[PDB]
Design a protein around this nucleic acid. Structure first.
Ligand SMILES: Cc1cc2nc3c(=O)[nH]c(=O)nc-3n(C[C@H](O)[C@H](O)[C@H](O)COP(=O)(O)OP(=O)(O)OC[C@H]3O[C@@H](n4cnc5c(N)ncnc54)[C@H](O)[C@@H]3O)c2cc1C
Length: 456
DNA sequence: CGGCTCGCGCA
DNA sequence: TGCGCGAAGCCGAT
């Protein structure tokens, strides 16, 4: 539908109907940003063709009760900066509270919407909201993949077994879908408070706050400043200062050599395509560039592939046949230790390395990538059953990780526990043929004592 | 049949 | 640290 720099393969039709005479409405759910947003740019293009203005709507659901203040304040403060950003472009932002299946449907009829566009997310609840919205509206409904460089329905048509199978498919379509982002043209036609929503939600999440012995909060919110402007600053410092040493020090939690982009990438405050755009043009270590590109392009977008083609991505059924048979055969094996969710959450295990990894999670909200595997694999080794291990790993991840409730999390948890996108290894006790990690193995790769002493 | 995102022994 | 090997099941290029 019109546009020169717009790839039609990024947008697909969810519902057909006669185009309305009112302004087009963009349902911002996953990509919370103004710049480098294909969904917002496409919505403006439809608005320009029909000589109507564009408007952005955000529906605040009750999902924040499951999570904590750390994700609520991160998302809410970014939205406050987002509201000012669209105001400079004469784009109004409307924030609702309630079920999207009824709030968005009512808003379309009340505002007399002409075209409805939303971003793409492979989550189960996102599809449920779309189906409820479709039955409640009679206007065209579109969906744009503004999160992945290559659209999820275009990269692959089936669930990918391993990364080596998905590697050639993604890199083959890169020269077409890797382009520059055109500027967002301001609106030509002009036509709840965000502070009150933050205050009300915080009070409802105060009892569930993670506290210390002296009733002191554990979360440290000064590590990551939320917002679109700060996300660019984090990416800028990574390329200039940390990209050169990424390829050799990304497995060292004692060194802050990671991009620290997941909290911004999860909420959509920065575009992964923009990050790839600047990294490809940077003169850095070729090994470091290849290692990082395989992380933000291959494994990041294969998590969407895993969740899109596997509705049970957070279940034992999603595990492949060889993993299920191995885990089932070792169900009756005696575990060395058995810890409950409360003991795992408090970091009260016999392993000081595991406790240190949990302490980093509770304090900063972003545990190091290498220690995340050992954090999740040891849960399986010290749990009643593989189903309980998956339950605890998901619960702790979605509650304390700033990048939690993301396809990158469920795929990562399934990789560590169920071996998704992995292969079989030496047969062992309890864990069976799932990939095994040991405390001594971490000793030969990084200074373990420094990591434990940093987080008690 | 070749190649895959651990621990382990050895410079 | 860095390198080669072991141990394991399976996709897919043919
Ligand atoms: C058990 C487990 C749970 C995880 N939980 C989450 C989660 O809740 N949310 C989340 O976004 N990521 C999660 N990860 C994936 C990964 O650990 C994080 O993306 C990364 O550690 C965040 O730090 P970083 O962005 O600075 O790392 P970087 O090395 O800078 O990563 C760059 C980017 O690449 C992507 N990426 C990196 N590693 C992975 C990976 N293993 N799988 C998929 N994409 C990746 C992310 O978008 C990340 O922002 C989890 C991994 C595991 C093993």
């Amino acid at each position: 539908p019109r546009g020169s720099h717009m790839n039609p393969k990024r947008i697909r039709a969810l519902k057909s109907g006669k185009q309305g005479d009112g302004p087009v409405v963009y349902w911002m759910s996953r990509d919370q940003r103004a710049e480098d947003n294909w969904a917002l740019l496409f919505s403006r293009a439809i608005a320009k063709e029909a000589n109507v203005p564009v408007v952005v709507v955000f529906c605040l659901t009750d999902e924040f009760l499951e999570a904590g203040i750390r994700q609520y304040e991160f998302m809410l403060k970014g939205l406050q900066e987002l509201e000012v950003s669209l105001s400079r472009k004469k784009i109004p932002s409307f924030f609702l509270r309630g079920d999207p299946g009824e709030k968005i449907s009512r808003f379309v009829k009340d505002y007399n919407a002409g075209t409805l566009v939303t971003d793409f997310s492979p989550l189960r609840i996102k599809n449920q909201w779309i189906e409820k919205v479709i039955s409640g509206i009679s206007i065209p409904f579109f969906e744009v993949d503004a999160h992945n460089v290559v659209p999820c329905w275009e990269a692959s048509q089936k669930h990918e077994y391993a990364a080596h199978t998905f590697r050639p498919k993604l890199y083959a379509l890169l020269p077409e879908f890797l382009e520059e982002f055109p500027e967002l043209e301001p609106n030509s036609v002009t036509p709840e408070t965000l502070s009150d929503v933050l205050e009300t939600g915080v009070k409802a999440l105060l009892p569930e706050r993670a506290l210390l012995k002296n009733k002191d909060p554990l979360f440290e919110p000064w590590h990551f400043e939320p917002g679109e402007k700060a996300a660019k600053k984090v990416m800028e410092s990574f390329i200039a200062d940390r990209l050169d040493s990424y390829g050799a020090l990304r497995n060292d939690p004692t060194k802050n050599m990671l991009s620290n982009l997941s909290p911004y990438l999860h909420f959509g405050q920065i575009s992964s395509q923009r990050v790839v755009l600047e990294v490809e043009k940077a003169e850095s270590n070729p090994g470091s560039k290849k290692a990082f590109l395989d992380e933000i392009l291959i494994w990041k977008e294969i998590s969407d592939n895993f969740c899109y083609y596997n509705p049970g991505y957070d279940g034992f059924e999603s595990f492949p046949s060889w993993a299920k048979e191995s885990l089932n055969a070792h169900r009756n094996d005696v575990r060395s230790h058995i810890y409950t969710l409360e003991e795992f959450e408090a970091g009260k295990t016999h392993d000081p390395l595991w406790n240190a990894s949990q302490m980093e999670l509770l304090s900063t909200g972003k545990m190091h990538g290498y220690t995340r595997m050992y954090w999740a694999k040891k849960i399986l080794e010290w749990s009643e059953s593989p189903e309980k291990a998956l339950e605890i790993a998901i619960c702790l991840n979605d509650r304390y990780e700033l990048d939690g409730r993301d396809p990158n999390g469920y795929a990562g948890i399934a990789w560590s526990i169920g071996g998704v996108h992995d292969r079989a290894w030496g047969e062992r006790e309890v864990t069976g043929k799932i990939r095994y990690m040991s405390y001594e193995g971490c000793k030969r790769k990084f200074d373990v004592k420094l990591y434990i002493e940093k987080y008690s």
